[PDB]
């Protein structure tokens, strides 16, 4: 077929196209007529092609995996199109709209013209879905990440390698669930193996966890198709399809041609001649370089001009000679194109997007015959023409410095823009080339050039990739994922023309030949320093310069080196022979020809380069400084190197900066920085800063730099200013524009010192530019710098984001919270810089001095843990007392040497031991004492939370209630009136810090507060916590009280080893040797604990990462005992529960952690109230978190005790009530978001020694482990005090106005020189001498410490003065209550939310004015925020009437106001919110019981609304509406059938369905559809539950009744009915009532507050 045409110079081979042969089978196409949501995006076409017909039935159902090969202009991209059309039909509702947040897609194309092209594409004919199509492009990961916040994305498969590698989108990477690979013959490219790691790394995780994700590859017509159909894991029968050249629906002439190269120009302008003269076709021509095109376009036009071959090409239609000249030379602004009245164009993508779309409408409208181009016009167009002559086949590649063949991508996708196929019946194709080129271009446009793999050439790095991922920890994790590339498939078929060396006969799936290479690889690896690697383990774990070699595209040979080469003491010019060096130009040569411009290039960079003037090394420096100095290169070999070397020099100057910065070297490390933005901006620090804005004119830049004006002075100047300093007015406007927009910073620093060595930094920055999206976008990046005064070491380093909302806010100030370590000979001071992570010349620097800082007192050695006698239970000199110990023959080393001073003395203690050394059985040694006394006086332990006194209740109630008679034990309750009495009906009682200071601030009053004798503090370092400042202020009130009565009190308290223990000590009034104080080391149990560091800046990310190296952790350090897994919140317990069980499944053992067999479990799994709970447990994980139920704890805990299931997984919030023990803990997280500050916030270390004290059931070696997984920058500080003790500080100074208010309430303090000795009772005072620094005290005297004391109670004094809650007399100095701080410390409502509670009166206050200001009270604002949970927040918000006046969504506020309100409308909630919910519910009572008493202080009686308002959230509903929603079992509807029948209020619905009066009982009971138990459920309701009995000059009422308890189903706990007596208006009284009253009101309404409609008027 094939005809052979040998010529004079040439030898030409004409392939004639095979007929169409495209109806053997009547294969008829599809109509099309889909459903209707798969319609739309098919806009200009009825039929599909004969193509997408066989693919359109596995497209639209079937879901496998896909490979479809055809020639370009096919129909490809419409069956991409299908399997997109597939996903989304899943994601749809039946005939709603699609939830769009569920799912992605990715399309990964070869070159970004194509991406380009794809996403216009796309983007039209997805938009009528509401889909947003977006290509994926950043220079900054702030880009990429907002752009993957859409649904389809289009990308390259470097940038999309790039993203994976860099493991910070993984939570939406998650969310793919399809891929489409365009031109997959790239895998023959040296390209291709990034592909083989993306697909290779996703088909594999997919086939661990089972998680699908569609796999579609779209190829073009070659052999080995099956090859990659069996690599992208399809059905042969049902996947893979192939199409011959006669599906193309042009068939196209293919003639090559072989030739040292004007032949070539001569032969394309003969052709230019037979095909545009004779047969009249327009025609385009590729070459491979943008002057080529116009050089090869003028050498045809030149020769056309000589021999008057011209008129034979020249059009000479009247419009067109006329019009294309016309519309094109006048309109042209590319100099070398303005040579297109003869019909030629150049098209070469280094031209206006104008000119671009100028000559791309004129070729289509006929206008231009001859348009040579390069590869860009190739791919992401739409413009065929009859003829293509890629003009050519050789191309200069910097990369190996020498020239190499033309990539057979690129020649497909030109040939296939060979003929239109509406227009013409056949294409023609060419190839011009050398005559050594036929065999190679022919077999490839005959489907026999085969596809290889050169993933050898990239392994090395490509397996540090997925090292780095946490893919492969060990050789057979890398011989799995081996088995998943490319080069894998090619190596089991046809191995020969790889060296596999045959040694591997017998190895069945190549197995061993994996091992063997990934050894090979992973040493190199191990050298290099980029990973550690156990040779015989097999194990190997990334490093952190390997995750700077895999972040960017660094190879592993240039990451050595720098490694080598990098030291502190580098300057510009060392670092730019660093860069030089690298081995990714060292194929680059220096050339003859280039000397001549190289020695002038030389001359002009500014930078000096020592190297040799003609070695490689000189050559890439002067390249890249020449690049930044924005100079000219009139040089085509030299252009390209200098192009390659600055497209690599972007990620290795990053790369040189991000070694610096974790090497801690802080001068080297900002200018890698500063070189970065050198290269990035393409700009010198010496140049004017408004070359980084691309809007500024060239004339602003050259006056400016014409100046001496420095930088900072053009900022904080207006239009005019501005021009007068610039001397242009015309740019005075233009300039302070820019200016504004300089990312700007202001920063503050305030320092703590916590120990001797280390001090805590809250540094403050608040931006101070002008936002802008066009160079902003919506986040920008910094980096905050500590370094020393010699700037040598960096003490602390972290990237902060200032997200838009934040940076607009009127609240603009952002919070960092750090710790650096310092010497005891202070240095002068530290520095603080924040510095833009893109822009030059943005820093704010800010000195840190310490020439008035005061270090805390030195620590003085914990108390020896002697090596005393064990003493054993007979010690104690009771049977009943030893019996309380059963089989226990001695005590520990620490109870023993404690027992004598509290079992034998009275004396007040403090012992201070790790967590779980028992210090529970001192304070019972201190009990046991207190109750061998005849008189046994009351005993009172408090704990500081709840969780921590209902523990240690239900032991002690079980234990000790039997001793000496019997001991009435009782814990307290919230309200007074009743744990009032519980105090005087027992003999022990416990209590949280608030619940006894709401009863020991009535001393002095009633007696029985005096006569406790025994006070136990559990947990004493908790003062420091959450609430802290309320223990405090009740210890220190005890003592106080035992020193006004003068009758004995103990004081015996308990914490973790502490630091500071002398103030402790002192302050309860503990003697020296009473002061036990251990070592942080003296545990019984040992701890072995291990510290992970993650540099991981996104949250999700960074837990997601966390995930498997804690299955890791519990399969290797506790492989056969239970573990206990902390984690930052609930919401993240059930997905860390999930991906735990996803990594189970990634090996082969989905039950790892299950070993009863499921069956016994069954019936408890069947009872657990959360599914997702339920899944767990089913496979032996489960979980524990606030939100969940008490029988699902229950389950839990018994599940775990038994040891039915090894895991337990429990939230942060639950580690004091997690009554639970393991010999593994995991501390996943280190920081928790909190929505107040829109920022993380550090683990107190109170909360990570609890949760490491759960660690205490030992091993083989007796020691327990645990594992603290936290960012790097934290490292030192929580491994610091998991190694020595706890420093423990008082917070009462940051609360003295909510210790005032209860303080003043009650006449304790009743003026400044009052509170000052109420103040020296406290821990606070103690502290403020030994670490002043801390408190803001400046001199260490009594004089600096008595004028600061009176100075914190004046401004305190001032603050509750000035917010109106007392008055203040300045003339005696005297202070008093005015009948608001008696509200306050009633109700315990903070003071911050009484003063926000003087915004009603003003006018008055109405039922929605008061729904709103309840929600804003600051209470509420401590409930958690999880993050993207808005939206059913606004749908809530949507549907209820009274709506906010300025809604802020993510605002607890807002928040709190919505939920109160779907409490009202009875609308179902998910759990996480229905706990919030709750939560609320819970003081949402207090609060409105408080605004009633306000209101009620005043005259205005817009307090009534209020307990409307009480009435209503205690029966969840509103206050217009029918009572009938409080009977049980009614409905709305069955409210319209009652409504229906007559009946409008409880009292009528009682009176109606009664037999033999009213006969509606036949029809109501069939009408309401209510059963039998229903009805009596209502019954019981209406009988006995909701009332109906009705009742200066004073009054007198009564009151009877026909009792305990309130019907409140939709509330979790109620205290019985309350009634208000109301008579500008005046009177207001509240008594409870119970079966009869009389009472008599003084003047000068009858309400409840849980029941409606009963309201005497
Ligand atoms: N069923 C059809 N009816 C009409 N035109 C089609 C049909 N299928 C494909 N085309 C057109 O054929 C051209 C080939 O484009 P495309 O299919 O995206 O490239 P490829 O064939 O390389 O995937 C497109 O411009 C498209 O509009
Ligand atoms: N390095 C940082 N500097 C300042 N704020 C941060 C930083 N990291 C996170 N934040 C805060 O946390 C929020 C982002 O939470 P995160 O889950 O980490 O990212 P995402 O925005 O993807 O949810 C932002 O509102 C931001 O204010
Ligand atoms: N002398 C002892 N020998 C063995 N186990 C003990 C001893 N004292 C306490 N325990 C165990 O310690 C657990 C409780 O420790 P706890 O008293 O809470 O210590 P801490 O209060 O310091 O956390 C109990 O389960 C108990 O069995
Ligand atoms: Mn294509
Ligand atoms: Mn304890």
Redesign the pocket.
Known sequence: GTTKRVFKGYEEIHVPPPKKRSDPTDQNIPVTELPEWARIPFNTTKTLNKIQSKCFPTAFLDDGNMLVCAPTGSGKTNVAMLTMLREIGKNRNEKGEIDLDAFKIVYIAPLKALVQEQVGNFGKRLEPYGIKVSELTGDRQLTKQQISETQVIVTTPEKWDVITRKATDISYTNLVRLIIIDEIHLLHDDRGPVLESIVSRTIRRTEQTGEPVRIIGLSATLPNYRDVASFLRVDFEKGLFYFDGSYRPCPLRQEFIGVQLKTMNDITYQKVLEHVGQNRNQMLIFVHSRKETAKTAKYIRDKALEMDTINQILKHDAGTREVLQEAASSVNNTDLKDLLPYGFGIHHAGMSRADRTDVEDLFASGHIQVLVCTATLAWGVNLPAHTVIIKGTQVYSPEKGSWVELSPQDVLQMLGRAGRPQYDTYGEGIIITTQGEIPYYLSLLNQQLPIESQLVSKLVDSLNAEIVLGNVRNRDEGVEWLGYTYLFVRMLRSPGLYSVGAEYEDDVALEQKRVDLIHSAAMVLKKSNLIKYDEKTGKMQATELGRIASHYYISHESMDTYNKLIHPAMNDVELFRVFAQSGEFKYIPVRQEEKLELAKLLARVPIPVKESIEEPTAKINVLLQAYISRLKLEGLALMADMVYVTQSAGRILRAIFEICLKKGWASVAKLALNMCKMAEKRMWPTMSPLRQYPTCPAEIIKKAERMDVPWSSYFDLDPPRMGELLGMPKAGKTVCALVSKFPRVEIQGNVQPMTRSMLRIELTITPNFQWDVELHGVTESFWILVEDCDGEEILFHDVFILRKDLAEAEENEHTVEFTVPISEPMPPNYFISVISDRWMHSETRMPVSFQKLILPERFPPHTELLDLQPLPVSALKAKDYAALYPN?Q???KI?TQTFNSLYNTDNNVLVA?????????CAEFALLRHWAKKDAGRAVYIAPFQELVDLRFQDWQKRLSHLRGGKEIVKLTGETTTDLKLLEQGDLILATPLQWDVLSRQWKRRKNVQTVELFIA?DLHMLGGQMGYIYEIVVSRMHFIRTQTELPMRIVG?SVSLANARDIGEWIDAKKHDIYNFSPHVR?VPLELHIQSYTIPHFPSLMLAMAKPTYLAITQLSPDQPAIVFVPSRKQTRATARDLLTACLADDDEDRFLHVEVDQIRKLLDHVQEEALAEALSHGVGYYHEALSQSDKRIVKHLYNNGAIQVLIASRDVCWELDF?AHLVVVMGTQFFEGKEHRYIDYPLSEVLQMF?KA?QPSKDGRSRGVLMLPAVKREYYKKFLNEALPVESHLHNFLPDAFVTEISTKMIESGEDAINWATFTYFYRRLLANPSYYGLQDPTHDGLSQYLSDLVETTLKQLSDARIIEMDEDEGTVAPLNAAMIAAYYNISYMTMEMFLLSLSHKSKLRTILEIVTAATEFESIQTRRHEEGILKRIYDHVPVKMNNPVWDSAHFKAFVLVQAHFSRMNLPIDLAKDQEVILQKILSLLSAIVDILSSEGHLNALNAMEMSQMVVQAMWDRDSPLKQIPNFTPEVVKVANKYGINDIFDFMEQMNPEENPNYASLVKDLGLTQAQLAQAANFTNNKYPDITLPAYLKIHIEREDPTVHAPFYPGKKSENWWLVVTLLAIKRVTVGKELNVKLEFVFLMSDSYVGVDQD
């Open positions: 226990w001695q005590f520990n109870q031991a790790p967590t779980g050394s028992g210090k529970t059985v559990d308990l019984p023990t004290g205490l």
